[PDB]
Design a protein around this ligand. Structure first.
Ligand code: NA
Length: 267
């Protein structure tokens, strides 16, 4: 009597920032790997916006960590951002997975991503506060619609899952389009902090809940599942934990190693 992934999968494999563990996060390389090669359930995307308003995939608000550049993403125009090298940094940090082709990987725009993997892929997109990038939500939905991902059919098959730590952002989207599946990202330790009334309300606009995996235990997991939630704890890269969590009853996980999780599911 619980809820199961809209993709109709008992266990969904969310490729955290793409094939994050083997390729430079948020790059065609990383996405190609997790989607084509490892064949993971979702292409997980983190949104940031350029100076001239282009939604692009990048985890931090600054290009420092993942490029040969410095500054806030919004200080760069899409054109300038495209000059950056979004791959080299990966070779240097993870020599054991390094690859010559990773050099000069580019930062992708949300449009390019949807464009590239088409309307049959499944996307897990994250938004920031309605104050940090005003208009982000309206833009995301417009982009999704452009790429035919807002069709009700696609929506109830799990082709789209919008996630965020900002209740404000999710609520804004829910008002604008009640049909887009929403996932509330819970912070580390924050899961405990909120009671049933809280969960009850979160559940009024979000079908899913994505807590830090370390805050999960078989009991709360069951409880959440009971409250009608779909649970996708985040960034589980250890087979051991993958197995444990699956036993608790989760519906999938965010991971930088799609294959490890898919194998744990196979067994
Ligand atoms: Na994320």
């Amino acid at each position: 009597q619980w809820h199961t992934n809209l993709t109709n999968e008992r266990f969904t494999t969310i490729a955290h920032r793409g094939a994050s563990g083997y390729a430079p996060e948020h790059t065609f390389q990383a996405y190609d790997k997790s989607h084509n090669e490892l064949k993971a359930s979702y292409i997980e995307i983190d949104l940031q916006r350029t100076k001239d308003g282009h939604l692009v995939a990048m985890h931090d608000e600054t290009v420092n960590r993942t490029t040969n550049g410095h500054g806030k993403v919004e200080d760069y125009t899409l054109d300038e951002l495209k000059q950056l090298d979004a791959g080299s940094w990966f070779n240097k940090k993870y020599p054991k997975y390094a690859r010559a082709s990773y050099k000069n990987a580019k930062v992708p725009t949300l449009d390019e991503i949807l464009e590239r993997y088409g309307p049959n892929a499944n996307y897990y997109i994250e938004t920031k506060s309605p104050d940090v990038y005003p208009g982000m939500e309206e833009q995301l939905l417009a982009s999704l619609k452009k790429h035919h991902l807002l069709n009700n059919n696609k929506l109830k098959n799990g082709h789209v899952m919008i996630q965020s730590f900002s209740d404000e952002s999710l609520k804004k989207i829910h008002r604008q389009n009640k049909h887009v599946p929403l996932v509330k990202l819970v912070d580390k330790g924050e899961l405990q902090q909120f009671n049933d009334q809280r969960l009850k309300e979160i559940r009024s606009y979000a079908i899913g809940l994505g807590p830090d995996y370390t805050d999960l235990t078989e009991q709360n997991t069951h409880h959440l599942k009971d409250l009608g939630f779909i649970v996708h704890p985040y960034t589980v890269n250890e087979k051991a934990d993958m197995l444990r969590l699956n036993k608790y009853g989760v519906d999938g996980v965010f991971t930088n190693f799609a294959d490890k999780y898919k194998e744990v599911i196979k067994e």
